[PDB]
Amino acid sequence: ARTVVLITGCSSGIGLHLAVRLASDPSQSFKVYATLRDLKTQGRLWEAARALACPPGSLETLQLDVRDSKSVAAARERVTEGRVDVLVCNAGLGLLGPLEALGEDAVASVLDVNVVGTVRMLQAFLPDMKRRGSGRVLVTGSVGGLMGLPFNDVYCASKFALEGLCESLAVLLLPFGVHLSLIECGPVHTAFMEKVLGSPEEVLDRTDIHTFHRFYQYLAHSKQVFREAAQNPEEVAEVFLTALRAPKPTLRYFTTERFLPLLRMRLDDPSGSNYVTAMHREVF
Amino acid sequence: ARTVVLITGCSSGIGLHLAVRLASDPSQSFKVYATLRDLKTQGRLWEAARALACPPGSLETLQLDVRDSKSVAAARERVTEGRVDVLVCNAGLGLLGPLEALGEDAVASVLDVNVVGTVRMLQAFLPDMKRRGSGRVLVTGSVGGLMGLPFNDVYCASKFALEGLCESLAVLLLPFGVHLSLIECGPVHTAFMEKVLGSPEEVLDRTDIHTFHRFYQYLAHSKQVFREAAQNPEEVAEVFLTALRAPKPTLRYFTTERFLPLLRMRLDDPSGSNYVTAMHREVF
């Protein structure tokens, strides 16, 4: 049969690009379920599908809200093949600003979607793969899951959470035949990140003038590395296929090597002094 | 004045031991607020306080539920000194079992208490320390926050979350004069961990016979290393004071070196293959 693939967070970003890259693979060996939390946003994905001319039936959109288990279960009730060969846990949202300026409900949604939502998908889909004795799970990581970044406290917390959650499962799954991989993405040409254009009073009336200024410094610095480092989504989506094809995949794949020198400083010094200091100067 | 100290999760464990170790320091330079989510459990802490004979007034118990922001705010309204010099984010809960056997509400509480609760405390207490230009925050870590452990998926997720959350803040706080440290604890002689004596059908009727068996293998192996590695709480609580006294503290303090060889294998190989494989054999 075809390789049944299910991806979350396909309204934009690497998710959208990966769904159409799959559904349009010249080999026609992939049936793709692209999930959206809100179908009102499914336009971009279909305009793209038509642009690559994916054959009718290689791509289906499903409404799936990872915050709701009922929605997660329903989603799998819609997979006709009654099987999922590759599960891509991609849905994820960011959060940027001084910790104190961040609302509790916002901090809650991030963990809820990034971490708990990935747990929900795994709970619904892991059993069958373990029983069949095969399956592949790809989790969209980030370099923010490998090192902490100022003003991204809660975001990094959620990506770090994924590193721990996945490393633990991988230890158990090893003998079960099902493979879990994290694709470590650096900055990629996609909205939100690059589109960070604002910094309202809300921040200011919620923090000190000295933190705010540091924030301005960070946003400025972040705009520069994104300029010199953002990757094309097609290049990143390809890393997912390289991982998907691998006979015996590794736990991590990095879409770039550009951030590796900073990662070396990190475990060359476990007490964290070299890193905290280097990162401070590299930003401020 | 005295060093005003506020600790969460003092009904038992390193929290209880640390509160009384502080309140009974021969120098009398510490006023301690030991918070409990339920005062019905404050017995052990007072029996211990009397055992070390802490002078009247060096220790106050406060009811503080880190799941509730209203409770968090109230707590700080009760700190007469109108200052907190050292904040110890200790409250934390574990979770053990096959991911699929774990209930959503249970996975939610763990993140909620371990991660969001630590965010709540930081939101309520960080501003003042930043404004005074001083303060110290000690966060109770774990080796489960440095490497993934089978059957501890959600627990590790929350400890990894803390590593990311703290490394990010530390990058910003550096120039503000306030210090954040993570005390990386390995196993310590305290209930839950050692007290893991059961494994109900609930696990079995919630997972496969092959996972269950692996679970038995893990619990058995974990009972052995705890035997050969658990530390006395007084030794661990002392690491918190060494960190608390340090003129220029580091980001991490490890209460033990016993797990360091495994941590070296971890970033000697970022793809995760050496670790996942080594850990698999070390357990199964």
Side-chain angles (χ1 to χ4, degrees):
Chain A
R2 292 177 155 180
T3 303
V4 185
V5 174
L6 186 133
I7 317 179
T8 56
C10 298
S11 68
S12 47
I14 81 97
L16 178 156
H17 281 275
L18 181 67
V20 304
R21 160 68 253 249
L22 255 16
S24 77
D25 178 69
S27 77
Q28 293 162 8
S29 51
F30 295 116
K31 162 55 183 287
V32 177
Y33 285 88
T35 84
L36 316 300
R37 182 196 65 166
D38 32 32
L39 290 177
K40 289 179 76 167
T41 68
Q42 70 173 324
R44 274 180 300 189
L45 182 283
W46 285 117
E47 171 180 36
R50 185 81 288 288
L52 292 174
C54 306
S58 60
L59 185 176
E60 295 305 338
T61 48
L62 267 47
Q63 191 282 344
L64 149 45
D65 181 15
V66 301
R67 280 181 292 188
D68 180 28
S69 56
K70 290 186 179 296
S71 189
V72 187
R76 63 141 158 44
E77 260 67 274
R78 296 160 258 158
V79 173
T80 310
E81 290 75 25
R83 199 184 73 250
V84 171
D85 297 276
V86 185
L87 174 65
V88 181
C89 292
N90 179 76
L93 73 87
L95 230 184
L96 187 81
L99 226 213
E100 64 265 33
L102 275 22
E104 189 214 278
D105 314 302
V107 166
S109 308
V110 172
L111 270 339
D112 191 4
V113 176
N114 295 8
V115 195
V116 189
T118 295
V119 170
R120 294 192 181 87
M121 295 303 295
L122 291 182
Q123 293 183 320
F125 295 92
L126 259 189
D128 323 334
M129 303 183 185
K130 285 210 295 190
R131 86 191 330 97
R132 301 185 231 119
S134 85
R136 194 142 320 179
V137 175
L138 291 183
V139 190
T140 299
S142 161
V143 301
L146 312 181
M147 64 188 69
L149 309 163
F151 298 104
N152 287 271
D153 311 298
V154 181
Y155 175 65
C156 289
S158 68
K159 307 316 289 202
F160 263 75
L162 290 177
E163 292 288 314
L165 172 84
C166 294
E167 204 167 270
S168 303
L169 275 166
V171 179
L172 171 64
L173 297 185
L174 200 58
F176 288 70
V178 350
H179 315 274
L180 189 326
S181 288
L182 285 147
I183 307 298
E184 312 294 8
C185 311
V188 307
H189 290 316
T190 282
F192 189 70
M193 316 166 88
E194 59 192 46
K195 308 314 198 313
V196 178
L197 190 69
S199 190
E201 285 185 343
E202 58 175 307
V203 177
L204 192 50
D205 65 64
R206 253 176 271 283
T207 199
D208 61 277
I209 188 54
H210 308 280
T211 293
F212 191 65
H213 179 84
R214 286 290 169 145
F215 195 25
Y216 177 98
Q217 292 187 132
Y218 168 78
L219 290 189
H221 169 86
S222 51
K223 294 311 92 194
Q224 190 55 232
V225 307
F226 184 95
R227 268 164 156 146
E228 73 185 34
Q231 274 182 123
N232 292 336
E234 299 86 1
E235 188 181 347
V236 163
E238 201 60 35
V239 176
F240 278 84
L241 275 96
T242 271
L244 206 159
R245 284 184 290 249
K248 185 53 60 165
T250 49
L251 183 60
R252 294 187 182 84
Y253 288 92
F254 308 85
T255 62
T256 174
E257 312 90 358
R258 189 200 170 293
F259 301 104
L260 304 194
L262 275 298
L263 212 222
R264 214 52 223 105
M265 205 174 311
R266 209 182 176 276
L267 202 55
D268 274 4
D269 182 57
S271 60
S273 316
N274 279 12
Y275 178 79
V276 168
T277 304
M279 181 60 44
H280 193 266
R281 316 286 177 189
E282 232 291 293
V283 176
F284 312 110
Chain B
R2 292 177 155 180
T3 303
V4 185
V5 174
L6 186 133
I7 317 179
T8 56
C10 298
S11 68
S12 47
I14 81 97
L16 178 156
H17 281 275
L18 181 67
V20 304
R21 160 68 253 249
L22 255 16
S24 77
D25 178 69
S27 77
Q28 293 162 8
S29 51
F30 295 116
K31 162 55 183 287
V32 177
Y33 285 88
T35 84
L36 316 300
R37 182 196 65 166
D38 32 32
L39 290 177
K40 289 179 76 167
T41 68
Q42 70 173 324
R44 274 180 300 189
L45 182 283
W46 285 117
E47 171 180 36
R50 185 81 288 288
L52 292 174
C54 306
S58 60
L59 185 176
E60 295 305 338
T61 48
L62 267 47
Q63 191 282 344
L64 149 45
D65 181 15
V66 301
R67 280 180 292 188
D68 180 28
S69 56
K70 290 186 179 296
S71 189
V72 187
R76 63 141 158 44
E77 260 67 274
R78 296 160 258 158
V79 173
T80 310
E81 290 75 25
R83 199 184 73 250
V84 171
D85 297 276
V86 185
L87 174 65
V88 181
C89 292
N90 179 76
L93 73 87
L95 230 184
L96 187 81
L99 226 213
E100 64 265 33
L102 275 22
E104 189 214 278
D105 314 302
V107 166
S109 308
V110 172
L111 270 339
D112 191 4
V113 176
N114 295 8
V115 195
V116 189
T118 295
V119 170
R120 294 192 181 87
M121 295 303 295
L122 291 182
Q123 293 183 320
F125 295 92
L126 259 189
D128 323 334
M129 303 183 185
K130 285 210 295 190
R131 86 191 330 97
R132 301 185 231 119
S134 85
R136 194 142 320 179
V137 175
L138 291 183
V139 190
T140 299
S142 161
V143 301
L146 312 181
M147 64 188 69
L149 309 163
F151 298 104
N152 287 271
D153 311 298
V154 181
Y155 175 65
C156 289
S158 68
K159 307 316 289 202
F160 263 75
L162 290 177
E163 292 288 314
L165 172 84
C166 294
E167 204 167 270
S168 303
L169 275 166
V171 179
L172 171 64
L173 297 185
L174 200 58
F176 288 70
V178 350
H179 315 274
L180 189 326
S181 288
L182 285 147
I183 307 298
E184 312 294 8
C185 311
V188 307
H189 290 316
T190 282
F192 189 70
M193 316 166 88
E194 59 192 46
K195 308 314 198 313
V196 178
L197 190 69
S199 190
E201 285 185 343
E202 58 175 307
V203 177
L204 192 50
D205 65 64
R206 253 176 271 283
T207 199
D208 61 277
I209 188 54
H210 308 280
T211 293
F212 191 65
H213 179 84
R214 286 290 169 145
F215 195 25
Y216 177 98
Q217 292 187 132
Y218 168 78
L219 290 189
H221 169 86
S222 51
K223 294 311 92 194
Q224 190 55 232
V225 307
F226 184 95
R227 268 164 156 146
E228 73 185 34
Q231 274 182 123
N232 292 336
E234 299 86 1
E235 188 181 347
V236 163
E238 201 60 35
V239 176
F240 278 84
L241 275 96
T242 271
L244 206 159
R245 284 184 290 249
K248 185 53 60 165
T250 49
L251 183 60
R252 294 187 182 84
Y253 288 92
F254 308 85
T255 62
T256 174
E257 312 90 358
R258 189 200 170 293
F259 301 104
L260 304 194
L262 275 298
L263 212 222
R264 214 52 223 105
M265 205 174 311
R266 209 182 176 276
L267 202 55
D268 274 4
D269 182 57
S271 60
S273 316
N274 279 12
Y275 178 79
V276 168
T277 304
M279 181 60 44
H280 193 266
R281 316 286 177 189
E282 232 291 293
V283 176
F284 312 110

